[PDB]
Write a protein that binds this ligand. Structure first.
Ligand SMILES: [Mg+2]
Ligand SMILES: [Mg+2]
Ligand SMILES: [Mg+2]
Ligand SMILES: [Mg+2]
Ligand SMILES: [Mg+2]
Ligand SMILES: [Mg+2]
Ligand SMILES: [Mg+2]
Ligand SMILES: [Mg+2]
Ligand SMILES: [Mg+2]
Ligand SMILES: [Mg+2]
Ligand SMILES: [Mg+2]
Ligand SMILES: [Mg+2]
Ligand SMILES: [Mg+2]
Ligand SMILES: [Mg+2]
Ligand SMILES: [Mg+2]
Ligand SMILES: [Mg+2]
Ligand SMILES: [Mg+2]
Ligand SMILES: [Mg+2]
Ligand SMILES: [Mg+2]
Lengths: 99, 124, 52, 193, 148
RNA sequence: AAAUAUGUAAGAAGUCCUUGUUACUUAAUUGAACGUGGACAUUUGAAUGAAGAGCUUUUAGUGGGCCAUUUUUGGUAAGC
RNA sequence: CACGGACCAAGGAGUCUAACGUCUAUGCGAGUGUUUGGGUGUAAAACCCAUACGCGUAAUGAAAGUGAACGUAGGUUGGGGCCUCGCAAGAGGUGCACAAUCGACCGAUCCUGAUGUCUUCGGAUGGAUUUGAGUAAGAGCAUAGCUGUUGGGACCCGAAAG
RNA sequence: GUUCUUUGUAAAGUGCCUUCGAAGAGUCGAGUUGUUUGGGAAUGCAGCUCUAAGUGGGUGGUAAAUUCCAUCUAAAGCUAA
RNA sequence: CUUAGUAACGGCGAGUGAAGCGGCAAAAGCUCAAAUUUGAAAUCUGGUACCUUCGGUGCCCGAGUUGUAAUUUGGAGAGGG
């Protein structure tokens, strides 16, 4: 971004020469790895779908993805998790049933 | 103030009159020139005595003033501003007076609503 | 060195001995000078004489 | 209740306040005991100083970011740059802080020299325990004081470009204020054919 | 001390300077700030106008730090140079060597322009300025520089 | 249409001449309001009086009253 | 013909604190305040002390913000004291505090929209029976004492109750 | 401080280059009811109903949608002054 | 110590009310879980003999692979070269 050198503005601050240090490992916490991929893949085929996920794929197959989100937002807590879950269910319908 | 003495000496005729102040005399840092002259007082600050002697002057005590000038001749008495004091802001507080309330903390929500505007009932 | 004078400093961070509101402690020495006596008008009479 | 022309006070004493009063009578004693702790501590530890050697840090916020001030510890980069291990550092009176990072150069330059000085002015004894004589110096902080960096010089020439300062500081605001409103125009006018 | 207080004088006078008719009773009018809109409303209009009601916006989690900007006038200005160096720069100045005056390092956020400076070039480093204070420094010979 | 009670005036912060200032006012530098300069002094413009004239700050008690001459409303009257 | 009081001794009622107003005294003075802590000590005393932090040195506006000299820091009328003339009575000269009065400056509100301009940003200049706890050669900071204020058992003794 | 003891084909640290990097669920989170806080379209705690993700998750003191940026690494644990 | 009787709450009434930054006192860091020792449960309570006894040495039962030691704890780190 680079600092301007004045007291107010868009890039507010003072010009000083930088270092940009080494990246920490703790920042990469969410990251998957190969052991988890195989594991999570192998547990899903054993366990199968839950009761709301038998109604969730039927709302996509019949009505549509607007009606599917509304339920997934009410079933899960939030709007951002209801985006994800619906996208996960468009791969469960795509990968298993058709192909 | 030492400036208040200088502005009294800028007067027409009063160049060489021994100025007299019954009280303290204080320094000022808002003047970059100051005349010669001879001041007579009870007290001087370290800064005011330094500023008068640096300009080739002389600080005199009130008993030395009596010896030099017994009937009080070629003298000019000065007095500091009494009403400038903060206590007299508040004296005479009432409606339509413009006088400052007695108040500790300021800012909005410290006496600016029902009483100081149309929008909140009335103005004073 | 510990208290200070006009010559040496003080040995206290920001200090100088205090000044006088009167230069001469003796009063009657001032009154009986000359410059005053010339200006002073003549004396009365100590304790009055009761007229009537 | 209310009378005269006095100011309006707010004195909070409607709770059982006399049950919870503290009066610091011990002030004079706690000093003496606090000084006995420092004389005790300097015995059992012996020739080492009473405190660790700390680093130089620039304070936060718009108020205090003129000052320079002692931080907690150095950094796993700053400990390595001087040429010693993070485990070995702690054993020689240095404070290593893992959780700070280095985004600034002028401080990092100072802190390496600060360690470089310290590292030269000590006597590390062997574990055999022969112990050559030396005698303690109680304060490291006294020996390596936090210097205050004089940025600008006294006498300089006079440059005059002619944009009035006050004009700069108003256009800086006026640009900031109207960014998104110009982005909204620039993004719509570009996409709309 | 107690021997100067007036309760020593009232010894031997029945009512202690409180009266026979009215007397000194517990809390006659009410405790504290009671009846400020009722039976003390004349004292609260005159002496405390504005008290009741509320006005501007709220501000959740304000910080006295974000609004730090202590001002300095052009009258003081020269006081930021040490006293031994002050007479050197005043007498016989030029564009080669003017004094730098770091106002942030001395502890000021803005340079207001209250009243008059001697005709000598200077350099003023400051976070903020006003329009008028910038004009007087220009007029004398100096300039302003912006920083953070 | 009284008597008793009640407002204002009896000068220097005033009176007269001289010709300046204005975005107000006049058909009109005519007026208006404040002025420069000059003229008028302790009979300076009724009596009597004046332990001085004026200004500020701050705080107590009190907020049940009653009586008498004259005027008076309620009431037959009342120490009402 | 209202209440308390048979008698004597001893005890028996406007206090201490936190935060404040006016007044007074002392220190220093555009600054002021050593005691949170450190140093030292004949050791709860006395002595010394770095950096910060208050209060003060600037206001105004709900805010974003903006931020105090057209002029010898203005004119007018008073004005103690001082200077010139005078034997005095008086006349001129300049006039600190303080008081009345017409202006300028700072911020709020309403109005006018100049050089320019990333075609919608900028706000020069000039106002207005408006508005402020403002400027106009700084006066406060600490400590101490009378009297006053509020919270506290709050001058001493007294319920029915909960 | 002085004088007898060597545990070891044992243990530890650092330079350089690759392929990798396991990270806590009836929990987080959401709704609703009660309490509590200075915490205001909800500061914490607890009941009941619902219930995740892994370039993810929490936080960013005004609710919501979309796009960015910064900062930490929860649901396991010890420890003088 | 200060922030501060402040930001905020409140028949917005009576009332209530913290936090970051700055100066000091004191300063100290770390441990599991999630990994194949697999060319050799490397670990451990007790019982029973002996000794230099806050415990050591040798046998015998038992606990334990539904995981006891070693290695690693995100500041990283491990296998390979
Ligand atoms: Mg009496
Ligand atoms: Mg009695
Ligand atoms: Mg009373
Ligand atoms: Mg009444
Ligand atoms: Mg009564
Ligand atoms: Mg009775
Ligand atoms: Mg009786
Ligand atoms: Mg007695
Ligand atoms: Mg009290
Ligand atoms: Mg009782
Ligand atoms: Mg009840
Ligand atoms: Mg974890
Ligand atoms: Mg809940
Ligand atoms: Mg509550
Ligand atoms: Mg614990
Ligand atoms: Mg305060
Ligand atoms: Mg609350
Ligand atoms: Mg609430
Ligand atoms: Mg409470």
């Amino acid at each position: 971004t680079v600092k301007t050198g004045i007291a107010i503005g868009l890039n507010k601050g003072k010009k000083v020469t930088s270092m940009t240090p080494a990246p920490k490992i703790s920042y990469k916490k969410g990251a998957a790895s190969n052991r988890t991929k195989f594991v999570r893949s192998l547990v899903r085929e054993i366990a199968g779908l839950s009761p709301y996920e038998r109604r969730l794929i039927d709302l996509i197959r019949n009505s549509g993805e607007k009606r599917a989100r509304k339920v997934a937002k009410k079933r899960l807590g939030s709007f951002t998790r209801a985006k994800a879950k619906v996208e996960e269910m468009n791969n469960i319908i795509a990968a298993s049933r058709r192909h | 103030s030492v400036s208040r003495i200088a502005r009294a000496l800028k007067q027409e005729g009063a160049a060489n009159k021994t100025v007299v102040v019954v009280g303290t005399v204080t320094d000022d840092a808002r003047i970059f020139e100051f005349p010669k002259t001879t001041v007579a007082a009870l007290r001087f600050t370290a800064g005011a005595r330094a500023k008068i002697v640096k300009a080739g002057g002389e600080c005199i005590t009130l008993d030395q003033l009596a010896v030099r000038a017994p009937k009080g001749q070629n003298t000019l008495i000065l007095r500091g501003p009494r009403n400038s004091r903060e206590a007299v802001r508040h004296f005479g507080m009432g409606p339509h007076k413009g006088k400052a309330p007695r108040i500790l903390s300021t800012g909005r929500k410290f006496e600016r609503a029902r009483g100081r505007r149309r929008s909140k009932g009335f103005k004073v | 060195q510990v208290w200070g004078s006009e010559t040496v400093a003080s040995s206290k961070v920001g200090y100088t001995l205090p000044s006088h509101i009167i230069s001469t402690s003796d009063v009657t020495r001032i009154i009986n000078s000359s410059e005053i006596q010339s200006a002073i008008r003549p004396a009365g009479q100590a304790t009055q004489k009761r007229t009537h | 209740a209310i009378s005269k022309n006095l100011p309006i006070l707010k004195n909070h004493f409607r709770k059982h306040w006399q049950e919870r009063v503290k009066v610091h009578f011990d002030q004079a004693g706690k000093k003496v005991s606090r000084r006995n702790a420092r004389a005790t501590r300097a015995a059992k530890i012996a020739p080492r100083p009473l405190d660790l050697l700390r680093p130089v840090v620039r304070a936060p916020t718009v108020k205090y970011n003129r000052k320079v001030r002692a931080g907690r510890g150095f950094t796993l980069a700053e400990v390595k740059a001087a040429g010693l291990t993070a485990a070995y550092a702690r054993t020689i009176g240095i404070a290593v802080d893992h959780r700070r990072q280095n985004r600034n150069q002028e401080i990092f330059d100072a802190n390496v020299q600060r360690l470089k000085e310290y590292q030269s002015k000590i006597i590390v004894f062997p574990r055999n325990g022969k112990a050559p004589e030396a005698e303690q110096v109680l304060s490291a902080a006294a020996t390596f004081p936090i210097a205050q960096p004089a940025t600008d010089v006294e006498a300089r020439a006079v440059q005059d470009n002619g944009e009035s300062a006050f004009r700069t500081l108003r256009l800086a605001r006026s640009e900031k204020k109207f960014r998104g409103i110009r982005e909204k125009r620039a993004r719509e006018k570009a996409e709309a054919e | 001390p107690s021997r100067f207080t007036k309760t020593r004088k009232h010894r031997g006078h029945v009512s202690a300077g409180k009266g026979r008719i009215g007397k000194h009773r517990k809390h006659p009018g009410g405790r504290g700030m009671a009846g400020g809109q009722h039976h003390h409303r004349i004292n609260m209009d005159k002496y405390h106008p504005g008290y009741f009601g509320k006005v501007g916006m709220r501000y959740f989690h304000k910080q006295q730090a974000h609004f730090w900007k202590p001002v300095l006038n052009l009258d003081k200005l020269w006081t930021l140079i040490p006293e031994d160096k002050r007479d050197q720069y005043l007498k016989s100045a030029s564009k080669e060597t003017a004094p730098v005056i770091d106002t942030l390092a001395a502890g000021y956020g803005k340079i207001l322009g209250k009243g008059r400076i001697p005709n000598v070039p200077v350099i003023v480093k400051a976070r903020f300025v006003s329009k008028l204070a910038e004009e007087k420094i220009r007029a004398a010979g100096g300039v302003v520089e912006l920083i953070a």
